[PDB]
Design a protein around this ligand. Structure first.
Ligand SMILES: [Mg+2]
Lengths: 82, 107, 69, 101, 106, 97
RNA sequence: UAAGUGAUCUAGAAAG
RNA sequence: UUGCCUUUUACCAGAACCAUCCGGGUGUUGUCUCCAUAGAAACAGGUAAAGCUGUAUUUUUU
């Protein structure tokens, strides 16, 4: 099974960042993920390529359109790796 | 314990207890009074031993025989046990006579 | 394999952000494993309505932001 | 009876002897003892009885020792084997019981 | 093979008995640890005016719950309090058989 | 010692310290029937030897019923129910002297 | 209608 | 502190400290015995055998 997916799952709870193919970055508490990176977040900001920020409550995001997901540095320490 | 396992350290024949188990158990019924008494006594003996633990020497490796071996005056053979026993009897006898004679009492 | 857990978003109004910087609105009725949304129709982002009930395809979805908390 | 707690009892007032003169210190304090006394009287009237508790028991004997258990129960004063539930796939006879504490 | 067999024939139990000068009738007996200082002096505690005698409080029970049933226990070790051993061994040279017990309902 | 009864210690004693439980003990225990032979005799010898409140309770019950009825069927206002209740009470009083 | 189960110390040799 | 006892040793049996002993491991050396003897191989990849992974139509690569 996908180790990045696993990592993402683990990160559940944390304040993750999230950019799409469109280039619109989000940053907030990760709620839920799946095998395909079907992310959900809570209490999340949303900045476009221009730079104008927009706050929002509950966002769901589809893994296909997701570019990359930034997790906090805490999960580097442990423990799903080895 | 004894058979549960299939590997072990060797105990001395001395250090095995085949009677112990019976007396530890509740006695088999319809036995005479004397037997019961004996059992009780055995239990008591066991219990006292258990209670007061005589923890052994930390220091002393040097057993008696080892020291003797370390000298030149002892040498060692392999002997039939009966022969050894006989020797002991004779040697022992000699010792007791010799000491007695030294004491002066030859009578 | 796993179903999208959108039971919290059932019967709620959702801003579906879709391909080409477009948007859809409406109350959520149903869904499946491919993320094909079934929702009661609303306006496309001044603003104008089309359709009664709508069924959106999974691939087209960029996001779906919950209007109702 | 025992200066020990009351259980499974109703207390409906029938009449209250309250005087014309009213003072908050006496009226309440007096009631405090008096109520208890009244309750006691009521209890006395109503054919009082001590209630001991009963432990609900579970024993889990083997099959063939049930008679022994029964005998034991008989020997104790209050005792009741309500049901001897058969613990499947095992020798045990999970016997529900009642024994006064 | 049943460990529960040794109830009130444990070393611990024996020790307790010794402490409490209380023979489990089958087992051994010793000189008491403490001399029985019979100096109650007819006090209001443990009187026969006060207590009830539904149970006879056998000395079997003393070494089982030493700290409870016995009053002023001294140098008393704690005993065990066990599970039951359903262990069936076949003596007729047969293999995996529900012999001594009974089948499930369904 | 077994049930508080055995001789404290085997030493000193100058005896086995053996303890047969007595069969007089049983006899001593058992004479509940013997007590009846005496107890029974004793028993034989000494063998031969409010309404207003109720009414009030009934009235109270009636009142309660009335209140319930009022609650059920058109009596959001207090005056009506109270009035009716009062009337009922009066009637009850009349009935009981 | 119900009695009667069990608790069992010891234990010799010298010199005086 | 008890008990047999009346003197002690030799003893009774419990307690508290203590020791002695009969033994036990573990580790490190050193020896004693019985069997034995090579000072250099991986890289380009094959030949053969052992360890694990695999079996284009919406979220990865058609
Ligand atoms: Mg002299």
């Amino acid at each position: 099974n996908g180790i990045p997916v696993k990592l993402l799952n683990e990160a559940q709870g944390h304040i993750v960042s999230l950019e799409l193919t469109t280039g619109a970055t989000y940053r907030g508490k990760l709620v839920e993920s799946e095998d395909s990176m079907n992310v959900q977040l809570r209490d999340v900001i949303a900045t476009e390529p221009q730079g104008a920020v927009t706050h929002m409550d509950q966002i769901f995001v589809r893994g296909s359109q997701i570019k990359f997901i930034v997790v906090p540095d805490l999960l580097k320490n442990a423990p799903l790796f080895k | 314990f004894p058979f549960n396992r299939t590997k072990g350290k060797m105990v001395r024949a001395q250090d095995v207890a085949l009677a112990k188990k019976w007396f530890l158990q509740h006695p088999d019924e319809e036995y005479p009074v004397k037997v019961k008494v004996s059992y009780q006594k055995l239990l008591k003996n066991y219990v006292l031993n258990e209670l007061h633990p005589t923890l052994p020497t930390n220091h002393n490796k040097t057993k008696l025989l080892k020291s003797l071996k370390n000298t030149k005056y002892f040498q060692q053979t392999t002997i039939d046990w009966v022969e050894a026993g006989l020797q002991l009897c004779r040697q022992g006898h000699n010792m007791l006579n010799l000491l007695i004679h030294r004491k002066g009492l030859t009578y | 394999v796993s179903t999208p857990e959108l039971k919290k978003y059932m019967d709620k109004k959702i801003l579906l952000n879709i391909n080409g910087s477009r948007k859809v609105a409406g109350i959520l009725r149903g869904y499946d494993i491919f993320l094909n949304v079934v929702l009661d129709d609303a306006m496309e982002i001044n603003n104008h309505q089309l359709g009664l009930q709508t069924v959106i395809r999974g691939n087209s979805i960029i996001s779906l932001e919950a209007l109702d908390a | 009876l025992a200066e020990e707690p009351i259980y499974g009892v109703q207390y409906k007032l029938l009449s209250i002897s309250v005087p014309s003169d009213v003072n908050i210190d006496v009226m309440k304090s007096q009631i405090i003892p008096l109520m208890k006394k009244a309750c006691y009287v009521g209890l006395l009237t109503a054919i009082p009885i001590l209630l001991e508790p009963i432990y609900e028991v579970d024993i889990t004997v083997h099959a063939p020792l049930l008679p022994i258990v029964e005998e034991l129960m008989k020997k104790r004063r209050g005792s009741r084997i309500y049901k001897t539930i058969k613990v499947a796939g095992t020798p045990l006879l999970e016997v529900r019981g009642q024994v006064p504490v | 093979t049943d460990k529960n067999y040794y109830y009130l024939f444990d070393k611990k139990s024996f020790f307790n008995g010794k402490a409490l000068n209380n023979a489990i009738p089958g087992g051994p007996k010793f000189e008491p640890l403490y001399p029985r200082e019979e100096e109650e002096d007819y006090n209001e505690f443990n009187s026969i005016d006060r207590v009830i005698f539904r149970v006879p409080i056998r000395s079997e029970y003393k070494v089982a719950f030493p700290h409870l049933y016995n009053s002023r226990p001294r140098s008393v070790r704690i005993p065990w309090y066990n599970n039951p051993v359903s262990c069936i061994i076949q003596n007729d040279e047969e293999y995996d058989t529900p012999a001594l017990f009974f089948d499930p309902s369904l | 010692s077994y049930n508080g009864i055995g001789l404290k210690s085997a030493k000193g004693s100058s005896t086995s310290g053996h303890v047969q439980r007595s069969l007089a003990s049983n006899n001593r225990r058992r004479p509940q029937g013997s007590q009846q032979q005496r107890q029974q005799r004793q028993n034989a010898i000494k063998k031969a030897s409010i309404e207003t409140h109720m009414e009030k309770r009934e009235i109270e019950v009636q009142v309660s019923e009335l209140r319930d009825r009022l609650e059920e069927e058109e009596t959001l206002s207090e005056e009506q129910i109270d009035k009716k209740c009062e009337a009922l009470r009066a009637k009850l009083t009349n009935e009981w002297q």
